[PDB]
Amino acid sequence: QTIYEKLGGENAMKAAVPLFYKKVLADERVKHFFKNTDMDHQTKQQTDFLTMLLGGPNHYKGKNMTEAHKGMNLQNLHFDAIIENLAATLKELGVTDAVINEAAKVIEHTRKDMLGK
Ligand code: HEM
């Protein structure tokens, strides 16, 4: 049983990523980072990336987390905002606190790869 299956699999991930961007794009701490970003592309990469990270099929062909955020000099508060919006998304979609916490614990290992790059 992977975290991806516990979340609801493909149809749940396809609903979660756009809801997560609706929340990120309303969040003052982070929305502006995406001003010049093709959000269709980004939704597809982030769907593939979280699907792979959370134990679903691995079709992620994008950049690593350092290259993805290179030049942005991201700060801790920006990563906390992302995790908070993803947790709020999964909660709103009906995922239990225990599964959200498992997912956040995997994603949290990426923090050192993207901050201050
Ligand atoms: C720390 C706060 C973060 C901010 C502000 C942020 C912002 C961004 C932005 C603006 C881009 C696209 C740059 C462009 O248009 O080329 C991007 C790329 C990406 N980000 Fe983040 N990100 C953050 C954290 C995360 C986290 C926690 C993850 C996954 C755990 C993630 C996964 C990705 C992925 C998969 C890409 C696509 C890379 C590709 O296109 O090859 N980011 N990020």
From Swiss-Prot:
Cofactor dependency: heme
Annotated cofactor note: Binds 1 heme group per subunit.
Molecular-function annotations in GO: heme binding; metal ion binding; oxygen binding; oxygen carrier activity
Keywords for the protein's UniProt record, in alphabetical order: Acetylation, Heme, Iron, Metal-binding, Oxygen transport, Transport
InterPro entries (alphabetical): Globin-like_sf, Globin/Proto, Globin_bac-like_CS, Hemoglobin_trunc, Hemoglobin_trunc_I
Source domain of life: Eukaryota
SUPFAM superfamilies assigned to the protein according to its UniProt record, in alphabetical order: Globin-like
Family: Belongs to the truncated hemoglobin family. Group I subfamily.
Name of the protein this chain belongs to: Group 1 truncated hemoglobin
Naturally occurring in which organism (per UniProt): Tetrahymena pyriformis
